[PDB]
Amino acid sequence: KVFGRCELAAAMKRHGLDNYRGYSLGNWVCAAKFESNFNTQATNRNTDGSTDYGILQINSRWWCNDGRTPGSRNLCNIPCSALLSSDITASVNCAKKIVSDGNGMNAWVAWRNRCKGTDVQAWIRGCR
Ligand SMILES: C[C@@H](O)CN1CCN(CC(=O)O)CCN(CC(=O)O)CCN(CC(=O)O)CC1
Ligand SMILES: C[C@@H](O)CN1CCN(CC(=O)O)CCN(CC(=O)O)CCN(CC(=O)O)CC1
Numbered sequence: 001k002v003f004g005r006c007e008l009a010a011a012m013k014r015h016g017l018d019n020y021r022g023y024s025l026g027n028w029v030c031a032a033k034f035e036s037n038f039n040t041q042a043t044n045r046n047t048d049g050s051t052d053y054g055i056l057q058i059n060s061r062w063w064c065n066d067g068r069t070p071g072s073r074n075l076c077n078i079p080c081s082a083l084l085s086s087d088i089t090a091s092v093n094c095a096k097k098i099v100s101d102g103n104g105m106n107a108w109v110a111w112r113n114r115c116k117g118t119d120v121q122a123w124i125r126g127c128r
């Protein structure tokens, strides 16, 4: 599924991302835009053999099982394919674990480089 900006903002709000560990909703919408282009089906392979999955590009190295990242962890206890779902529940629940791990949203390279220190409110401006 390719989300609209306000559609995704509303879904992320409903699942409790707005102000989660102090990150306003616009941070999450900005991260999703540059990580996946709001596309739940986005996959990107990393040089180490791990893959990033879904709207927030969650890494199979630590967070999910794709059966092809040897000696990887599955800390969200999900098949990586569940992160490609039109329903962002799994992605959101797993993202809550990552952002909680001490590094906050710096885990998302696109957030660090393209969202951090910007007017992130702009990403939810106009949405009901
Ligand atoms: C509502 C319109 O803005 C939709 N838009 C109309 C054309 N726009 C005009 C403009 O953006 O001022 C120029 C192209 N636009 C640049 C950009 O948005 O960054 C990219 C495509 N957009 C992406 C988006 O807007 O979500 C969809 C089409
Ligand atoms: C052409 C316009 O799109 C100009 N735009 C500024 C005004 N936009 C308007 C809008 O997106 O409706 C609001 C904020 N915008 C939300 C979004 O893009 O999803 C994020 C910043 N954008 C990133 C981009 O557009 O790729 C920078 C350029």
Ligand SMILES: [Gd]
Pocket: none
């Ligand atoms: Gd924009």
